[PDB]
Design an enzyme around this catalytic site. Structure first.
Site, mmCIF file in Angstrom:
data_model
loop_
_atom_site.group_PDB
_atom_site.id
_atom_site.type_symbol
_atom_site.label_atom_id
_atom_site.label_comp_id
_atom_site.label_asym_id
_atom_site.label_seq_id
_atom_site.Cartn_x
_atom_site.Cartn_y
_atom_site.Cartn_z
ATOM 1 N N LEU A 154 0.642 -1.265 -0.023
ATOM 2 C CA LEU A 154 -0.209 -0.216 -0.122
ATOM 3 C C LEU A 154 0.544 0.780 -0.095
ATOM 4 O O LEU A 154 1.312 1.003 0.392
ATOM 5 C CB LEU A 154 -1.554 0.117 1.340
ATOM 6 C CG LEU A 154 -1.827 -1.293 1.287
ATOM 7 C CD1 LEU A 154 -2.723 -1.235 2.504
ATOM 8 C CD2 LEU A 154 -2.812 -1.077 0.047
ATOM 9 N N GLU A 214 6.432 0.703 4.090
ATOM 10 C CA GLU A 214 6.078 -0.412 3.643
ATOM 11 C C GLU A 214 4.904 -1.331 4.619
ATOM 12 O O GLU A 214 4.765 -1.924 5.382
ATOM 13 C CB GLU A 214 7.178 -1.696 4.214
ATOM 14 C CG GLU A 214 8.284 -0.986 3.052
ATOM 15 C CD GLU A 214 9.574 -1.362 3.479
ATOM 16 O OE1 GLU A 214 9.440 -0.433 4.633
ATOM 17 O OE2 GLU A 214 10.844 -0.873 3.389
ATOM 18 N N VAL A 215 3.977 -0.344 4.157
ATOM 19 C CA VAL A 215 2.856 -1.005 4.545
ATOM 20 C C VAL A 215 1.484 -1.715 3.569
ATOM 21 O O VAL A 215 1.834 -1.625 2.535
ATOM 22 C CB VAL A 215 1.538 -0.212 5.286
ATOM 23 C CG1 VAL A 215 0.819 0.549 4.135
ATOM 24 C CG2 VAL A 215 0.591 -0.951 5.939
ATOM 25 N N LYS A 218 2.415 -4.233 8.956
ATOM 26 C CA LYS A 218 3.492 -3.056 8.554
ATOM 27 C C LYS A 218 4.669 -3.796 9.435
ATOM 28 O O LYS A 218 4.798 -4.916 9.943
ATOM 29 C CB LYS A 218 3.061 -1.938 9.594
ATOM 30 C CG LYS A 218 4.482 -1.504 9.562
ATOM 31 C CD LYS A 218 4.383 0.163 9.601
ATOM 32 C CE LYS A 218 2.976 0.750 9.428
ATOM 33 N NZ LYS A 218 2.317 1.048 10.106
ATOM 34 N N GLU A 230 -6.509 -4.518 12.293
ATOM 35 C CA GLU A 230 -7.701 -4.488 11.219
ATOM 36 C C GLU A 230 -7.261 -3.713 10.156
ATOM 37 O O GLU A 230 -6.341 -2.783 9.584
ATOM 38 C CB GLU A 230 -8.715 -4.410 11.950
ATOM 39 C CG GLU A 230 -9.382 -2.350 11.676
ATOM 40 C CD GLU A 230 -10.688 -2.074 12.707
ATOM 41 O OE1 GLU A 230 -10.773 -1.757 14.250
ATOM 42 O OE2 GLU A 230 -11.579 -2.727 12.637
ATOM 43 N N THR A 271 -11.158 -0.992 4.420
ATOM 44 C CA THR A 271 -11.407 -1.279 2.640
ATOM 45 C C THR A 271 -11.007 -0.215 2.102
ATOM 46 O O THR A 271 -11.184 0.392 0.621
ATOM 47 C CB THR A 271 -12.602 -1.884 2.173
ATOM 48 O OG1 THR A 271 -13.536 -0.700 2.875
ATOM 49 C CG2 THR A 271 -12.470 -3.193 2.923
ATOM 50 N N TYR A 272 -10.828 1.115 2.571
ATOM 51 C CA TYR A 272 -11.175 2.548 2.229
ATOM 52 C C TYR A 272 -10.071 3.609 2.252
ATOM 53 O O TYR A 272 -10.286 4.748 1.390
ATOM 54 C CB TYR A 272 -12.850 3.219 1.974
ATOM 55 C CG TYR A 272 -14.212 2.912 1.592
ATOM 56 C CD1 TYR A 272 -15.035 1.472 2.340
ATOM 57 C CD2 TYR A 272 -14.395 3.288 0.039
ATOM 58 C CE1 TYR A 272 -16.149 1.045 1.763
ATOM 59 C CE2 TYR A 272 -15.952 2.447 -0.236
ATOM 60 C CZ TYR A 272 -16.415 1.271 0.219
ATOM 61 O OH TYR A 272 -17.614 1.272 -0.571
ATOM 62 N N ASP A 298 -0.735 13.026 16.092
ATOM 63 C CA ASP A 298 -1.122 13.762 15.460
ATOM 64 C C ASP A 298 -2.766 13.365 14.081
ATOM 65 O O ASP A 298 -2.437 12.099 13.862
ATOM 66 C CB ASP A 298 0.472 12.456 14.421
ATOM 67 C CG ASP A 298 0.169 13.026 12.405
ATOM 68 O OD1 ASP A 298 0.237 13.958 12.688
ATOM 69 O OD2 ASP A 298 1.074 12.529 12.325
ATOM 70 N N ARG A 311 -5.731 12.661 7.087
ATOM 71 C CA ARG A 311 -5.008 11.631 6.593
ATOM 72 C C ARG A 311 -4.859 10.308 7.871
ATOM 73 O O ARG A 311 -3.939 9.067 6.759
ATOM 74 C CB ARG A 311 -3.589 12.455 6.208
ATOM 75 C CG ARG A 311 -2.659 13.058 7.209
ATOM 76 C CD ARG A 311 -0.763 12.663 6.798
ATOM 77 N NE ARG A 311 -0.569 13.372 8.079
ATOM 78 C CZ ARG A 311 -0.312 14.764 7.758
ATOM 79 N NH1 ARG A 311 -1.482 15.404 7.591
ATOM 80 N NH2 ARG A 311 -0.041 15.416 8.909
ATOM 81 N N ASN A 312 -4.493 10.902 8.751
ATOM 82 C CA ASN A 312 -4.535 9.041 9.356
ATOM 83 C C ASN A 312 -6.097 8.830 10.671
ATOM 84 O O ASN A 312 -5.965 8.611 11.008
ATOM 85 C CB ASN A 312 -4.009 10.064 10.818
ATOM 86 C CG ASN A 312 -1.760 10.292 10.559
ATOM 87 O OD1 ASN A 312 -1.825 9.839 9.857
ATOM 88 N ND2 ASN A 312 -1.484 11.355 11.330
ATOM 89 N N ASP A 357 -4.515 4.872 15.211
ATOM 90 C CA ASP A 357 -3.872 5.039 16.611
ATOM 91 C C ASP A 357 -2.074 4.285 16.995
ATOM 92 O O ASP A 357 -2.053 3.183 17.524
ATOM 93 C CB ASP A 357 -4.897 4.420 17.624
ATOM 94 C CG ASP A 357 -4.769 3.317 17.531
ATOM 95 O OD1 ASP A 357 -4.840 2.509 15.548
ATOM 96 O OD2 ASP A 357 -6.100 2.579 18.682
HETATM 97 C C1 LIG Z 1 0.841 1.931 10.476
HETATM 98 C C2 LIG Z 1 0.603 2.537 9.678
HETATM 99 C C3 LIG Z 1 -1.219 1.693 9.580
HETATM 100 C C4 LIG Z 1 -1.726 1.279 8.069
HETATM 101 C C5 LIG Z 1 -3.535 0.702 8.017
HETATM 102 C C6 LIG Z 1 -3.953 0.284 8.841
HETATM 103 N N1 LIG Z 1 -4.652 -0.425 8.583
HETATM 104 C C7 LIG Z 1 -5.139 -0.417 7.453
HETATM 105 N N2 LIG Z 1 -6.290 -0.461 6.596
HETATM 106 C C8 LIG Z 1 -6.697 -0.059 5.476
HETATM 107 C C9 LIG Z 1 -4.885 0.826 4.896
HETATM 108 C C10 LIG Z 1 -5.262 1.451 3.142
HETATM 109 C C11 LIG Z 1 -5.619 0.436 2.735
HETATM 110 N N3 LIG Z 1 -6.156 1.531 1.340
HETATM 111 C C12 LIG Z 1 -5.438 2.183 0.552
HETATM 112 C C13 LIG Z 1 -5.081 3.060 1.330
HETATM 113 C C14 LIG Z 1 -4.492 4.320 1.668
HETATM 114 O O1 LIG Z 1 -4.890 5.366 2.284
HETATM 115 N N4 LIG Z 1 -3.220 4.661 0.438
HETATM 116 C C15 LIG Z 1 -2.741 3.705 -0.663
HETATM 117 C C16 LIG Z 1 -2.617 6.258 -0.208
HETATM 118 C C17 LIG Z 1 -4.802 2.774 2.726
HETATM 119 C C18 LIG Z 1 -3.935 1.046 5.673
HETATM 120 C C19 LIG Z 1 -4.081 0.666 7.271
HETATM 121 C C20 LIG Z 1 -1.161 2.489 7.402
HETATM 122 C C21 LIG Z 1 -0.404 3.464 7.194
HETATM 123 C C22 LIG Z 1 0.569 3.058 8.930
HETATM 124 B B1 LIG Z 1 2.064 3.860 8.828
HETATM 125 O O2 LIG Z 1 2.252 4.373 10.024
HETATM 126 O O3 LIG Z 1 2.971 3.916 7.826
#
Ligand SMILES: *Cc1cc(-c2c[nH]c3ncc(-c4cncc(C(=O)N(C)C)c4)cc23)ccc1B(O)O
Length: 263
Positions: free
Chosen positions: A16, A17-18, A33, A78, A81-82, A125, A129-130, A143
Site C-alpha cells: 500500500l 512498507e504497509v 506493517k 484490522e 477498505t476505503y 498526529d 490522512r491518519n 492510533d
Molecule cells: C501503521 C500504518 C497502518 C496503516 C493501516 C492500518 N490499517 C489499514 N487499513 C487500510 C489501509 C489503506 C488501504 N487502502 C488504501 C490506503 C491509502 O490511503 N493509500 C494507499 C494512499 C490505506 C491502511 C491501513 C497505514 C499506514 C501505517 B503507517 O504509519 O505507515
C-alpha cells in the site's frame, strides 16, 4: 504474550512498507506493517505497538498481532477498505457523503478521542490522512503514534523533532509540549478538513509565518456550507490557552446532539 504470532500465519497480497494481507487462520484480510532494519526509530514504533495492546474502541484501529522476535517485524491491524479519510473526502460523491455524513464522521472521531482522553493518552498526529474509512462511512482513528501520560498532563517531544505545522497547537510549536488539549487543537483542524472535503489548511500561507499569525489571533475562516455551531466548536478548539479549549467529552456530547438533531 497472546499478541505474538509467527510470520508464516500471514500471506502478503499488495503493497500500500504497509501491506494488505490475509491472516490464513481466520481468512481475514489484514493490514501488515513491516520494519526492515533494526534502528532506534524502528524500536520506538514497536514500543508504540505495545500501547496498542491496551486500547479497544470501535472507532480506533484494532491491533491484531505482532512479530517481535526477529526482523523483519510485523504489526498486524484490522483492514479498512476505503483507505484514508483525506483521499476519501476529496474523491467522494458529495450527494452521498453529505452534511449528515460529515456530522456522523465527526461524532465517531470525537467518540474515540473521548476514550483516549479518559485513559489519559495523547495522539500527537490527529489529521484526516491518519483516519481510515470502512464501509458505510465508518471512520477509525489510526492510533499508531499514541503516547501514555505516565505522570502529569504534558508530554515533551525530543528537541529537534519536526511536526506538521498547520495541525500543531501553538504550545507544541513553541515549546514541544503536547497534551490532550493539543489534540483538541488538532481536532479543530481535522474538523476544518472534513468540512472542506479535504482542503489543505491555511491555503497559501507560508509555513514559517503560521505561528506569528496565530499569535496575532488569526484563525481559519468558516468554510462554505459549514453550520455556524460547528464553526463555533472549531474556534473553541483554537483558543490560545489550552485550558480555554473544551474537553473531548464536551465535544462528543455536542456532536452527538447535533447528529441526532438531523432528522
Ligand atoms: C501503521 C500504518 C497502518 C496503516 C493501516 C492500518 N490499517 C489499514 N487499513 C487500510 C489501509 C489503506 C488501504 N487502502 C488504501 C490506503 C491509502 O490511503 N493509500 C494507499 C494512499 C490505506 C491502511 C491501513 C497505514 C499506514 C501505517 B503507517 O504509519 O505507515
Amino acid at each position: 504474550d497472546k499478541w505474538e504470532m509467527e510470520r508464516t500465519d500471514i500471506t502478503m497480497k499488495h503493497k500500500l512498507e504497509v501491506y494488505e494481507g490475509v491472516w490464513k487462520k481466520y481468512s481475514l484480510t489484514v493490514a501488515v506493517k513491516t520494519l526492515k532494519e533494526d534502528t532506534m526509530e524502528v524500536e520506538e514504533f514497536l514500543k508504540e505497538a505495545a500501547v496498542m495492546k491496551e486500547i479497544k474502541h470501535p472507532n480506533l484501529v484494532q491491533l491484531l498481532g505482532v512479530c517481535t522476535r526477529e526482523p523483519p517485524f510485523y504489526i498486524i491491524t484490522e483492514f479498512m477498505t476505503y483507505g484514508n479519510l483525506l483521499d476519501y473526502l476529496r474523491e467522494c460523491n458529495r450527494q452521498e457523503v453529505n452534511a449528515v455524513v460529515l456530522l456522523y464522521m465527526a461524532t465517531q472521531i470525537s467518540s474515540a478521542m473521548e476514550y483516549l482522553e479518559k485513559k489519559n493518552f495523547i495522539h500527537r498526529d490527529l489529521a484526516a490522512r491518519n483516519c481510515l474509512v470502512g464501509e458505510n462511512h465508518l471512520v477509525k482513528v489510526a492510533d499508531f503514534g499514541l503516547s501514555r501520560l505516565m505522570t502529569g498532563d504534558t508530554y515533551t517531544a525530543h528537541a529537534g523533532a519536526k511536526f506538521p505545522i498547520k495541525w500543531t497547537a501553538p504550545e507544541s510549536l513553541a515549546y514541544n509540549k503536547f497534551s490532550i488539549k493539543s489534540d483538541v487543537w488538532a481536532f479543530g483542524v481535522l474538523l476544518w478538513e472534513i468540512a472542506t472535503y479535504g482542503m489543505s489548511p491555511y491555503p497559501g500561507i507560508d509555513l514559517s509565518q503560521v505561528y506569528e499569525l496565530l499569535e496575532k489571533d488569526y484563525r481559519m475562516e468558516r468554510p462554505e456550507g459549514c453550520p455556524e455551531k460547528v464553526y463555533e466548536l472549531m474556534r473553541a478548539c483554537w483558543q490560545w490557552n489550552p485550558s480555554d479549549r473544551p474537553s473531548f467529552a464536551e465535544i462528543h456530547q455536542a456532536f452527538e446532539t447535533m447528529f441526532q438533531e438531523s432528522s
